Subunit: 251 residues, 4 copies
Amino acid sequence: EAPAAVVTGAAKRIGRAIAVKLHQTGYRVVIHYHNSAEAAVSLADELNKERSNTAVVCQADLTNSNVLPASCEEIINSCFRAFGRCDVLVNNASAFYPTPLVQGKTVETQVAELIGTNAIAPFLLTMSFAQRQKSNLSIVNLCDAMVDQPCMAFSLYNMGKHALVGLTQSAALELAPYGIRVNGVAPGVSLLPVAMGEEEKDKWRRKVPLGRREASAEQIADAVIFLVSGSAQYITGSIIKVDGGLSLVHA
Amino acid sequence: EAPAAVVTGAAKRIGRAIAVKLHQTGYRVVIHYHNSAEAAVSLADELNKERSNTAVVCQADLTNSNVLPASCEEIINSCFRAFGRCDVLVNNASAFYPTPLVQKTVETQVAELIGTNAIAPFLLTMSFAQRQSNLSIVNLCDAMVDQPCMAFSLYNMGKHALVGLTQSAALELAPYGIRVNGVAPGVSLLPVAMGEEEKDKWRRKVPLGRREASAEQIADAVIFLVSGSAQYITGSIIKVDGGLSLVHA
Amino acid sequence: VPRGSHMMEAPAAVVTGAAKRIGRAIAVKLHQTGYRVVIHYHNSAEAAVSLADELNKERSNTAVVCQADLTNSNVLPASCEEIINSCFRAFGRCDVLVNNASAFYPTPLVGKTVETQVAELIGTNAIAPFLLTMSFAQRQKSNLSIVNLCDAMVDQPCMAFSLYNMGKHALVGLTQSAALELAPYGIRVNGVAPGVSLLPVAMGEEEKDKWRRKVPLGRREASAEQIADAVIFLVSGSAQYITGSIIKVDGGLSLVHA
Amino acid sequence: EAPAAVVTGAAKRIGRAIAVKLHQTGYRVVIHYHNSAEAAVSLADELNKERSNTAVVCQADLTNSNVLPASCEEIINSCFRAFGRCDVLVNNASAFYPTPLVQGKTVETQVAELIGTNAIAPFLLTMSFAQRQSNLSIVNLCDAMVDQPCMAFSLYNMGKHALVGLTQSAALELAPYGIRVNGVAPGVSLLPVAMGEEEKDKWRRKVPLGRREASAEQIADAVIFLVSGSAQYITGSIIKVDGGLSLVHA
Ligand SMILES: NC(=O)C1=CN([C@@H]2O[C@H](COP(=O)(O)OP(=O)(O)OC[C@H]3O[C@@H](n4cnc5c(N)ncnc54)[C@H](OP(=O)(O)O)[C@@H]3O)[C@@H](O)[C@H]2O)C=CC1
Ligand SMILES: NC(=O)C1=CN([C@@H]2O[C@H](COP(=O)(O)OP(=O)(O)OC[C@H]3O[C@@H](n4cnc5c(N)ncnc54)[C@H](OP(=O)(O)O)[C@@H]3O)[C@@H](O)[C@H]2O)C=CC1
Ligand SMILES: NC(=O)C1=CN([C@@H]2O[C@H](COP(=O)(O)OP(=O)(O)OC[C@H]3O[C@@H](n4cnc5c(N)ncnc54)[C@H](OP(=O)(O)O)[C@@H]3O)[C@@H](O)[C@H]2O)C=CC1
Ligand SMILES: NC(=O)C1=CN([C@@H]2O[C@H](COP(=O)(O)OP(=O)(O)OC[C@H]3O[C@@H](n4cnc5c(N)ncnc54)[C@H](OP(=O)(O)O)[C@@H]3O)[C@@H](O)[C@H]2O)C=CC1
Ligand SMILES: N=C(N)Nc1nc2c(Cl)cc(Cl)cc2[nH]1
Ligand SMILES: N=C(N)Nc1nc2c(Cl)cc(Cl)cc2[nH]1
Ligand SMILES: N=C(N)Nc1nc2c(Cl)cc(Cl)cc2[nH]1
Ligand SMILES: N=C(N)Nc1nc2c(Cl)cc(Cl)cc2[nH]1
């Protein structure tokens, strides 16, 4: 019978690409979403049309709060309720916006969203995933190849992504005895923000050595699929950059 | 007039040594503390005896919460209230304990470890910057975060976040002339609760002298980074670890 | 290129140090994937010829051997050009270069002269990869890539292995520099960094176990095939946006403190 | 009596600033040079005018060859010959020029010069320094930008990455002997002599902290810290002195 995966923030963009590629590889999938209900259900419908009873949706806010542990436990529970097992967790959901140090969401909200989605929710999901297995089990964290050459005024986002690197390493060490591998995929520029104009998109594209273009969502998903596959059975604690050389380019 | 520094978690151990060395170099100091009231006041007394009106205390919990931004603003404000300026911030305060992935409530663990090690440094950095010469921030990092202790996920997340803050803030505050750097101890003062046998197991791992760093040795690197000898240094993290991070399993 | 290269039908790869162990496993997996291969070797002539024979028995004239010493010297550039040349001679193209050959032995700071130590360790681990990379790039006449065999433990090195560690760090530098410079030609350059994989056959099991016990994921060394799996990924169509990346394949070893 | 230091490539630029600051701190100095004989002697004269018998020059080519071990042993010997001790080694000398992968110096020469000066000579000097053995330490001049390299500088980058490996390996191995090994990694400091004003300004404008290059003295200040009593627990560390340059994305 088929293994099952949870993908967070899977309604659109890179998370959808990961969900689709896992499903095409033979996984049953939980499509987690927050606000994108119509898109999430649309995706689940397409996947169920291909193979009945292979996709469910699960709504949760991954903002930090005193109930975030319960929400994370519930996402994992939803995989077990639907499919009776949970083999793979992909921590994809992410808030991304500037938080200038020097001078509209309050700073409290900023911290809760950016640190919650990028770091604390992955940690709590990792706890819940592990405790339900306390076979090819693994976790893949969506990192960021540019966190050592950060965008100006993105402190909280960068803190969150650096914390995610720390989680990837700490959890790899601690979960290795349970046979759970923990790895990361670090895009450079992939799908550009919906709000961004084409001229600004091209500015980013022209910086990439390998082809002067952003990664497709499928290219990111290809790295995730490698890491969950049997071809990566000895790999844990690794972060694979998928950035077209962007992080090698000086100012 | 004498420049002023805020040191978090400065009542004891490494934070105390930093406060003392900054004071000896000529700074007026805010000694932040959480629970160690007696030690904080005794330190302020000791420093004030050397030079009148050069040390104060400020109590605050740096656990993450919706009131933490206000608390951090008040820590910076305490420096301005006492000394009229704030030239240096040292983010030293830190919770440190294991948080196993397979298990205080988890939300308390998150609040304490990510609050003290990352979120409070960010909020303090924001408050410090909003006010603003030789201005700089020094973050107390950890040389061993890429080879972490088993079951310290939250602590390690907080310290990695602190590296990210050091880099992002260095970039963003450079236009204002505020340098932002880190000092990364390996093993320095070992936990008060740790038996000597276990302490010795750690000491034996250190290539340079088979001993932990004194608090003074960590403070020496902080002093360098705040000094005129480090005027072009920003976004750097200086390991002070006796080669410990070089030693394989 | 002499007629009968079948250059239109299949890609070709050079694997250095490919007679045994990890290099052999890489050559075998590339061959199994559909590549023709050059098996480079230095002293392991019987093993290299035997391997190429077995591959040719599977699919005729899909493997050749090329002997070269990769020690640094004033003839090393010519030796490296000849290795790349041998791929073009045999197969009419060279799509992949795997820099696997490596000398590995202690060189304490406090029988071989120091100059031999430098020549062997820096030659095999760094200079020969550089010269092979140059020859590979210049000869380009499409999924082209280079994979460099790095070392996951180069930031926590074995005691008294300074020259080896210097060589492996230089190889990281080459991976990054070549990724940037060759990207406009569509050549990707990546690395695979084992931790502990196949240990010396001669090493006592009791010593092997000292290393195995350090590995979080399964308390075992990687197989050569597990290392080769990462090389296969990097050369594949599933890695077409990946350049300048080094994939650790170490079972968590590099995460373990002293 | 005064400790002694060897500074490689000390006749000009950053190595000169390092030698001066060491001398000002009370060290006797060996000013190594290769081509810059007049400058080396000029510096030695200035330092000896300040304190008699505290500075000597030593000529050596640090290009890789089968006699490079002997040359490095001789540089260390020169310090013992002059001063009777050698407490500090600063590996500063460095070749720096492009070596494109795709097409008057042969590739053999390019390898020998770039890998020799930046990596192999530091290793051999480290070996000789250790073998010939207060507060002993080695400082390696690294490069803050080696993970975001200039186009077509592969051999230089290989050399500087090897130098990081040496710094780490030698710190581990020499720690039981009380020898610390550290590095200082400039970003942009003194710009190339050949570079015109427009190009120099292009590079200056990239640096977040002050939109200027490091002075040689700023680089020297970090070397001084690393050899000082204020760094006695520091080994295997590389201090970036780059004004934030390495933090700036494309
Ligand atoms: N795109 C790129 O170029 C790059 C991406 N990455 C990383 O790759 C991953 C995927 O990137 P991308 O597809 O662009 O991501 P998006 O910005 O599209 O975000 C993915 C999803 O995150 C979910 N999310 C946001 N906030 C919350 C919240 N508070 N609670 C729960 N879910 C939330 C949203 O779900 P919903 O819509 O249902 O509300 C959103 O659709 C992210 O981790 C990202 O940081 C890294 C570098 C570059
Ligand atoms: N000691 C070592 O070997 C190492 C230390 N470091 C780093 O160096 C720094 C100093 O280390 P060390 O002196 O051992 O630190 P301690 O563990 O002694 O903690 C320093 C102070 O942090 C304060 N603190 C703890 N929790 C809170 C909280 N919730 N709110 C506010 N303040 C709080 C405490 O103040 P109070 O007592 O007043 O309650 C405590 O005295 C830390 O950042 C640490 O992570 C890094 C690696 C190794
Ligand atoms: N095995 C492990 O645990 C680890 C391996 N690695 C790396 O992975 C790669 C493969 O490892 P492994 O299979 O153990 O390597 P080996 O030690 O088996 O060496 C591979 C081959 O290198 C060739 N070689 C050595 N010296 C020279 C020379 N002077 N000129 C030409 N070729 C030479 C030899 O060819 P011949 O026999 O024909 O003379 C040898 O078979 C290496 O790059 C290694 O550093 C990294 C970390 C750990
Ligand atoms: N300047 C900068 O912006 C940066 C410098 N650095 C590093 O800092 C250090 C100092 O930089 P800088 O002052 O610019 O260095 P230079 O480029 O000025 O070189 C210093 C000295 O190296 C010596 N040298 C060169 N080739 C050889 C050789 N074959 N044998 C012996 N000595 C040789 C020369 O001695 P002579 O003149 O006597 O022949 C030269 O004066 C170097 O390691 C450099 O890589 C790193 C990043 C940036
Ligand atoms: N959640 C996200 N959209 N994260 C994210 N999106 C990113 C983009 Cl469009 C570019 C870079 Cl350089 C980093 C990015 N991180
Ligand atoms: N707040 C603290 N005491 N932090 C801290 N303390 C530490 C100790 Cl005694 C050892 C290591 Cl390796 C890391 C440490 N981090
Ligand atoms: N050429 C080699 N055999 N390289 C090599 N072999 C290695 C082994 Cl057997 C263990 C570790 Cl830690 C590193 C190694 N590097
Ligand atoms: N020997 C040298 N001059 N080395 C050297 N010089 C350098 C300069 Cl003027 C800039 C950068 Cl980014 C790196 C450099 N490395």
